[PDB]
A paper describes a structure:
P-type ATPases form a large membrane protein superfamily that couples ATP hydrolysis to the transport of cargo across biological membranes. In human cells, P5B-ATPases execute the active export of physiologically important polyamines such as spermine from lysosomes to the cytosol, a function linked to a palette of disorders. Here we describe a series of cryo-electron microscopy structures of a yeast homolog of human ATP13A2-5, Ypk9, determined at resolutions reaching 3.4 Å, and depicting three separate transport cycle intermediates, including spermine-bound conformations. Ypk9 exhibits ten TM helices and a soluble N-terminal domain (NTD) in close proximity to the membrane, perhaps involved in lipid regulation.
Next, additional structures were determined, all in the presence of SPM, and using N- or C-terminally linked GFP protein. We exploited conditions in the presence again of BeF3− (yielding a structure at 3.7 Å resolution overall, denoted E2P*), or without a similar compound (3.5 Å, E2.PiSPM). Structural analyses to SERCA and ATP11C-CDC50A suggest the SPM-structures are indeed caught in separate E2P and E2.Pi configurations, with the E2.PiSPM structure indicating the presence of cargo is sufficient to stabilize an E2.Pi state. While the E2.Pi structures are highly similar, distinctions are identified between the two recovered E2P states (see further below). Spermine uptake is accomplished through an electronegative cleft lined by transmembrane segments 2, 4 and 6. The cleft harbors an additional, elongated density compatible with the presence of SPM. Equivalently, completion of cargo-binding is linked to the proceeding E2.Pi state, where SPM is accommodated in a cavity on the luminal side, coordinated by conserved acidic and hydrophobic residues, including the conserved VPPALP motif. As such, the composition of the cavity also allows binding of shorter physiological polyamines, e.g., SPD and putrescine, in a similar manner. Indeed, the NTD-domain is displaced between the E2P and E2.Pi structures.
Numbering used by the authors: 203 to 298, 315 to 547, 558 to 719, 745 to 798, 826 to 1019, 1034 to 1394
The structure:
C-alpha cells in the first residue's frame, strides 16, 4: 500500500514527512559486531548521521504495522521513536466497525494516530468521540470504566515536558563530533609526552561540559515548572462526586466550577449551568473580567473543536484552559484534554526545536571542518615526507597525526565562549540576569525591537491625569490644575471640587492591611490624590498647608454590569456633599438633568475616548436633607432617579519617565521599534505618540472592513486615518492618496489575522515593514507577528513584562523579560529593574560580545595557521618545536591573551552602525586570510634570514627522537611568539563597539607581561632557560633582527587590518559581479523599505 505520508503540520511553520520504515533485519547482529568492535561507528557515527543507520537496519514497509517509525522534518533532521501498543479501542469516532491494536506516535508533543481502514496517520483531534447527545446525558457524567478507555487514548491534563534523565542529556551533549575529536587529541597528547596542556584542555572542556549541562538542566526546569499545575477538583460524575486531582479526568467528565478551592480553571470546558466570571490576562491578554453564560443545546450540538479559532458566539459558552477566576460565581463539561487544548497548542509551540537562525556557532564549526580537510592534506604530505627520511613508525604516526591537531585547535570553541561569559558577568553586575548565553551575541544583530504597553514601557496600574469640573456657572470648561481649588471659586449649596473629592473615596469598598489598600486597582488610585484619604472611622488626616472634615456611611459597590453606584451620607452641615454617585458617561448623561449639562457632555467624552483615556462620571443626586435616619434602607432604583453629573475623573496609562529617552536612543541608533499590545487601539496610539514610536504630527492609519464584508475569505479593506479622516490608502500599494509624510500604520489584531490568512504577500510585507502599533493582539498573534518579522529578515527582539506572553519571548531572537529573577520562565534575559533601560544595555553588550567573539575566532584561526606554518617549515628536516615551547605557546600566549582580549566593556554610546555578523562573508575571511599570508611571509623571511647566518646550526634528521636544538627552531619559535602577541594586539577591537585598548588595563598589562617575558627570554635568558626550552645560541644583532621582524610584522598587520585589508575586501566586492553579476539578495525588509520610499513615493 502507501508507504510515505507527506503532510504539513497544523501550524504553518513546522512541516514533516512521516516515513514508515521497517523494524530491523537479520543483519542487526552483523551490524552489532561490525560497528561496535571498533567502538566508534554505531554509537558515535550513526548517531551523528542517522541517514545511513536507517538505510542499513531497515528496508521498507508500506504496511504501518512495524515496531518503530522514523520522522523526517523540513530541516533534514530525523529522529527515531517506537510504536506504542494499546489493547482495545472500538469506536471509529475516536480517531475521527471495531478497531484493535491502535498504532500511535508522539513526535514533538504531536499525537499521530494511525487509522486502519484509511491506512493513514492523522493528527486532528477535533471530533474525539464526543458522545454529548443531549443535555440530560451531559449532566449524567460518564458511568463505568470507560474513563480508563478514554484515558489511555488521550492521557491526562498534564502537559509536562519530556524530563530527560542525566544519563540521556550526558550522551546527548558529551558525544558531539568535536568532543570526540578532543578526546582523540587528548589521547595523542598523553601518548606524545604532552601532559600539562592536555590537562589544561581537559579542565577547560570539563568546565564547558558542566556549564552547558547545568544551563540545559535549568532551561528544562524552567520549562517544566512553568507548565505544571495540580489541583483537587470536586466532581467527575453526577452521582457520587468526590475530590480527585485534576490530572485524572478525561474528555467527557463534568466538574463543578463553583468549588471554593478552584482558583483557576484546569481545562477548557463548556458551561452547563450557572454563570461565571473569568480573567483572561495570560490568554488573549485582557485583564478585564469577562462574563461566561451557560451553553445552550443548539450551541452544544454545533461543536467543531478541530480549529483553534472559532466564531464569537461559541467563545461565551466554554471556558479557557489555565485562566484565573475573579470570583466563584456552576458546573461544566470538559471538551478536550492535554496538549491539544487552547493553552496546550500554545505551550507545544514553545517546545519545538528552534531553527537556530544565528549561524556563527555553526559557521565556526564549518570552517573547522574546512581546516580539517586541509589538515588531511597536511597529514598526507607530512607522511610522504617522513617516509623519505625513513623515521620510526611510532614517531612518524605521532608527528603526522599531531599536525592534524595543530591545524584544527581543540581550544577554538572553548575560547569562543569566554567573551560571551564576560558579557554575561557584566550583565549580572548591571542587575540583568540572562539564562541562555548564546543569545547574547544575537543581541548584537538586533534590527527591530518590539515592546508591550501592558507593564513594560507603561506603569501597570491605571493613573489619574486630572479632573474635569461641571462648571454650572459658566458652561465653558475651565483649565485643569491637578490640585485642590475648593475655595478658589464658589461656582452656596455645594461646590463641585469638594463634591468630586468626596466622590473619589465614597462609592467603593476599600480596606487596609498594611499601608496599601485591598480594593480593585481601578478605584485604589483615586484616594491617594490630594492626601485626604479616609479609611477608618469618619475623619482623616488633612495636611497643614480651611478644608472641611470628611465622613462617609452606607457604603456600596460599583457593579461593572450596571455601571452605577450611589451613596447618601451627611458629611458637613446638613445639605453639603450628601449624595455622591459614581457612573459611566455612556448612558447616564441621558439620565442626567439637562439643566446641569454644560453642552460639553458628548464632544469631550468623544475626544477623550479617541485619546484613549478612561472617563468616569461623578454625579451629585439632588435629594432633600429630610431623609437622614439611623435605620435607613432604600433600594437602588429609588435613589437612581435624577443623578445629574457634576464632573469627570480621568484615568490613563502613564508611561515610565525613562521610556521616552530609551525609545529616542533606539530610534537614533538605527533600530526600529514597534509596539505589540492587547488593549484598545485608542490608547496604544496615544502611548506610541508619547514615547516616540510614532513621530509627532505623523498621521496614523487603521484598516477597516467598511469597503467589503466582515471576514471569512472575502473583504475589502479601507485604510483610514485616526485624526483628519477620509485620507485613504490604496489597499494594493499602501500609499497616501493625494486626493514624505510619515505613514505610521497601526493594524489591529483581528485584521492582522485576516491579512496573514489571505492577502497579497506584497501587501503583507508592506504592512509588516510599515507597522508601528499592533493592538488587540493575543499572544498567539504576538508570536505569529514575531515569526513574520523573522520571515522578512528582521532579527527582532521582544521586550515584555512578566511571563504571560513568553511565546513571543522565546520566538524572538532576544527575549528580554522585565520580571523577577525567580518569576521569569522561558526567557533568554531577565531584568530586575522594571524600566526599559535594559534594552540599550542588552543590545550594547551584545554588540560588544559579537565583535569580541569575531576577534577571538580570527585570533584562534591565526594561531592555528601560524603554528601550522612554523611546524611545517620544520617538518622538512624531521624536526619540530620543543615539548615546552609548545606548552609556552599554547598556555601562556594564547589562553591569557584570549581571555584578556575578551575582557573589555562596550562603548557607552549606542552607535548607528551594526557589527558584522556573518562569519563567511568577505568582510571577515579576507582580512583573516591576508593576516595568515603576512604571518607566513614574516616567518618565511625569518627562516631565510637565519639560514644564511655564519653560526647556523643546521637541523639533523633523526630516527628515534626528533632533535629540537637547531638554529632554525629558535628563530621559528621567537618569530612565532611575536606573531602571536602582536596578532592579539592587532585583532583586538577598538572604539566603535567596545572599550578602547588604552582605556582598559588587564589587556595592556597582559600584552606587556607576555611581551617583556618573551623579550627577556630572547635577549638575556638564564642558564636554566636554555636546556629547559631547548634554545640555541644566536647573534645579538640577529636578536635585534628578530625584534625588527616582529615590529615590522606588527606595523604591516595593523596597517592591513585598519587601512588596507578593508580596501581589499571592497575590491573583491567590486570585482564580485564581474564573474556572476546577479546582485546578492539583501534583507527583505531593506528591499521593501527602499522600494517603498523611492519608487512608490516618487510617483506623485
Amino acid at each position: 500500500g502507501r508507504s510515505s505520508q507527506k503532510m504539513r503540520l497544523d501550524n504553518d511553520d513546522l512541516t514533516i514527512a512521516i516515513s514508515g520504515f521497517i523494524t530491523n533485519r537479520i543483519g542487526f547482529a552483523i551490524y552489532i559486531v561490525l560497528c561496535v568492535l571498533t567502538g566508534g561507528i554505531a554509537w558515535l557515527f550513526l548517531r551523528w548521521y542517522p541517514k545511513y543507520y536507517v538505510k542499513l537496519v531497515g528496508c521498507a514497509t508500506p504496511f504501518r504495522d512495524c515496531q518503530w517509525v522514523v520522522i523526517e522534518d523540513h530541516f533534514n533532521k530525523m529522529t527515531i521513536l517506537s510504536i506504542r501498543v494499546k489493547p482495545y479501542n472500538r469506536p471509529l469516532s475516536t480517531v475521527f466497525p471495531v478497531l484493535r491494536e491502535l498504532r500511535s506516535i508522539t513526535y514533538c508533543y504531536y499525537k499521530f494516530y494511525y487509522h486502519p481502514v484509511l491506512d493513514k496517520f492523522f493528527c486532528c483531534n477535533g471530533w474525539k468521540d464526543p458522545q454529548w447527545n443531549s443535555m440530560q446525558n451531559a449532566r449524567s457524567g460518564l458511568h463505568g470504566d470507560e474513563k480508563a478507555h478514554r484515558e489511555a487514548v488521550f492521557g491526562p491534563n498534564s502537559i509536562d515536558v519530556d524530563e530527560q534523565s542525566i544519563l540521556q542529556l550526558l550522551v546527548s551533549e558529551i558525544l558531539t563530533p568535536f568532543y570526540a575529536f578532543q578526546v582523540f587529541s587528548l589521547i595523542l597528547w598523553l601518548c606524545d609526552e604532552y601532559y600539562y596542556y592536555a590537562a589544561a584542555i581537559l579542565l577547560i572542556s570539563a568546565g564547558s561540559i558542566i556549564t552547558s549541562l547545568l544551563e540545559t538542566k535549568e532551561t528544562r526546569r524552567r520549562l517544566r515548572e512553568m507548565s505544571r499545575f495540580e489541583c483537587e477538583v470536586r466532581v467527575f460524575r453526577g452521582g457520587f462526586w468526590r475530590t480527585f486531582p485534576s490530572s485524572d479526568l478525561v474528555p467527557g467528565d463534568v466538574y463543578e466550577v463553583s468549588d471554593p478551592s478552584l482558583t483557576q480553571i484546569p481545562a477548557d470546558s463548556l458551561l452547563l449551568t450557572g454563570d461565571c466570571i473569568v480573567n483572561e490576562s495570560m490568554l488573549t491578554g485582557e485583564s478585564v473580567a469577562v462574563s461566561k453564560t451557560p451553553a445552550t443545546n443548539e450551541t452544544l450540538a454545533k461543536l467543531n473543536p478541530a480549529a483553534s479559532t472559532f466564531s464569537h458566539d461559541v467563545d461565551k459558552h466554554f471556558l479557557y484552559c489555565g485562566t484565573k477566576l475573579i470570583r466563584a460565581r456552576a458546573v461544566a463539561l470538559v471538551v478536550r484534554t492535554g496538549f491539544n487544548t487552547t493553552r496546550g497548542a500554545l505551550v507545544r509551540s514553545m517546545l519545538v526545536p528552534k531553527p537556530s537562525k544565528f549561524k556563527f556557532y555553526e559557521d565556526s564549526f564549518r570552517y573547522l571542518k574546512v581546516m580539517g580537510c586541509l589538515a588531511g592534506l597536511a597529514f598526507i604530505v607530512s607522511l610522504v615526507n617522513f617516509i623519505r627520511l625513513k623515521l620510526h613508525w611510532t614517531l612518524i604516526l605521532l608527528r603526522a597525526l599531531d599536525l592534524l591537531t595543530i591545524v584544527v585547535p581543540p581550544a577554538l570553541p572553548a575560547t569562543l565562549t569566554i567573551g560571551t561569559s564576560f558579557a554575561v558577568q557584566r550583565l549580572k553586575g548591571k542587575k540583568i540576569f540572562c539564562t541562555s548565553p548564546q543569545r547574547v551575541n544575537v543581541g548584537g544583530k538586533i534590527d527591530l525591537m518590539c515592546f508591550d504597553k501592558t507593564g513594560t514601557l507603561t506603569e501597570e496600574g491605571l493613573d489619574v491625569l486630572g479632573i474635569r469640573v461641571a462648571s454650572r456657572v459658566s458652561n465653558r470648561f475651565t483649565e485643569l490644575l491637578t490640585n485642590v481649588d475648593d475655595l478658589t471659586w464658589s461656582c452656596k449649596p455645594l461646590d463641585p471640587y469638594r463634591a468630586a473629592l468626596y466622590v473619589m473615596a465614597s462609592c467603593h469598598s476599600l480596606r487596609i492591611v498594611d499601608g496599601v489598600a485591598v480594593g480593585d486597582p481601578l478605584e485604589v488610585k483615586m484616594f491617594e490624590f490630594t492626601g485626604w484619604s479616609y479609611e477608618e472611622g469618619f475623619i482623616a488626616g488633612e495636611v497643614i498647608s480651611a478644608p472641611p472634615a470628611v465622613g462617609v456611611l452606607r457604603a456600596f459597590d460599583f457593579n461593572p454590569l450596571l455601571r452605577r453606584s450611589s451613596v447618601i451620607a451627611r458629611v458637613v452641615g446638613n445639605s453639603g456633599g450628601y449624595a455622591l454617585v459614581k457612573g459611566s458617561p455612556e448612558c447616564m448623561p441621558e439620565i442626567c438633568r439637562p439643566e446641569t449639562l454644560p453642552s460639553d457632555f458628548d464632544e469631550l467624552l468623544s475626544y477623550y475616548t479617541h485619546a484613549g483615556y478612561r472617563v468616569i462620571a461623578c454625579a451629585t443626586k439632588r435629594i432633600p436633607k429630610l431623609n437622614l435616619v439611623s435605620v435607613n434602607r432604600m433600594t437602588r432604583d429609588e435613589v437612581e432617579s435624577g443623578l445629574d453629573f457634576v464632573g469627570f475623573i480621568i484615568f490613563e496609562n502613564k508611561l515610565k519617565p525613562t521610556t521616552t529617552s530609551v525609545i529616542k536612543e533606539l530610534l537614533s541608533s538605527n533600530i526600529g521599534t514597534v509596539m505589540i499590545t492587547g488593549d484598545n487601539i485608542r490608547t496604544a496610539v496615544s502611548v506610541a505618540r508619547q514615547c516616540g514610536i510614532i513621530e509627532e504630527h505623523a498621521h496614523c492609519y487603521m484598516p477597516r472592513f467598511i469597503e467589503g464584508n466582515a471576514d471569512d475569505c472575502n473583504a475589502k479593506l479601507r485604510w483610514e486615518s485616526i485624526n483628519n479622516p477620509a485620507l485613504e490608502l490604496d489597499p494594493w500599494t499602501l500609499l497616501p492618496m493625494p486626493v514624505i509624510r510619515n505613514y505610521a500604520i497601526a493594524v489591529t489584531g483581528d485584521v492582522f489575522r485576516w491579512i496573514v490568512d489571505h492577502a497579497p504577500t506584497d501587501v503583507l510585507h508592506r504592512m509588516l515593514v510599515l507597522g508601528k502599533v499592533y493592538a488587540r493582539m493575543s499572544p498567539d498573534e504576538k508570536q505569529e507577528l514575531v515569526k513574520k518579522f523573522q520571515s522578512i529578515d528582521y532579527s527582532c527582539g521582544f521586550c515584555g513584562d512578566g511571563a504571560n506572553d513568553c511565546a513571543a519571548l522565546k520566538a524572538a531572537d532576544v527575549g528580554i523579560s522585565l520580571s523577577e529573577a525567580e518569576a521569569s520562565v522561558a526567557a533568554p534575559f531577565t531584568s530586575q529593574i522594571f524600566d526599559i533601560r535594559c534594552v540599550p544595555e542588552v543590545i550594547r553588550e551584545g554588540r560588544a560580545s559579537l565583535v569580541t567573539s569575531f576577534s577571538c575566532f580570527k585570533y584562534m584561526s591565526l594561531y592555528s595557521f601560524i603554528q601550522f606554518t612554523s611546524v611545517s617549515f620544520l617538518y622538512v628536516s624531521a624536526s619540530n618545536l620543543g615539548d615546552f615551547q609548545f606548552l609556552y605557546i599554547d598556555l601562556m600566549l594564547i589562553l591569557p591573551i584570549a581571555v584578556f582580549m575578551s575582557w573589555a566593556g562596550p562603548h557607552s554610546k549606542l552607535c548607528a552602525k551594526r557589527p558584522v555578523s556573518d562569519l563567511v562573508s568577505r568582510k571577515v575571511l579576507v582580512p583573516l586570510l591576508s593576516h595568515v599570508f603576512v604571518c607566513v611571509m614574516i616567518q618565511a623571511l625569518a627562516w631565510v634570514a637565519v639560514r644564511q647566518q655564519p653560526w647556523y646550526i643546521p637541523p639533523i634528521v633523526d630516527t628515534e627522537k626528533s632533535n629540537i636544538e637547531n638554529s632554525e627552531n629558535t628563530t621559528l619559535f621567537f618569530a612565532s611568539c611575536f606573531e602571536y602577541i602582536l596578532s592579539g594586539v592587532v585583532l583586538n577591537a577598538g572604539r566603535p563597539f567596545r572599550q578602547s585598548p588604552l582605556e582598559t588595563w588587564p589587556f595592556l598589562s597582559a600584552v606587556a607581561v607576555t611581551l617583556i617575558a618573551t623579550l627577556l627570554m630572547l635577549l638575556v635568558p638564564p642558564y636554566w632557560l636554555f636546556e629547559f626550552m631547548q634554545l640555541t645560541w644566536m647573534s645579538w644583532t640577529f636578536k635585534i633582527t628578530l625584534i625588527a621582524f616582529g615590529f615590522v610584522y606588527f606595523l604591516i598587520a595593523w596597517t592591513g587590518e585598519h587601512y588596507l585589508f578593508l580596501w581589499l575586501a571592497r575590491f573583491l566586492g567590486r570585482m564580485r559581479q564581474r564573474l556572476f553579476k546577479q546582485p546578492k539578495q539583501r534583507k527583505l525588509y531593506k528591499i521593501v523599505k527602499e522600494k517603498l520610499v523611492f519608487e512608490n513615493l516618487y510617483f506623485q
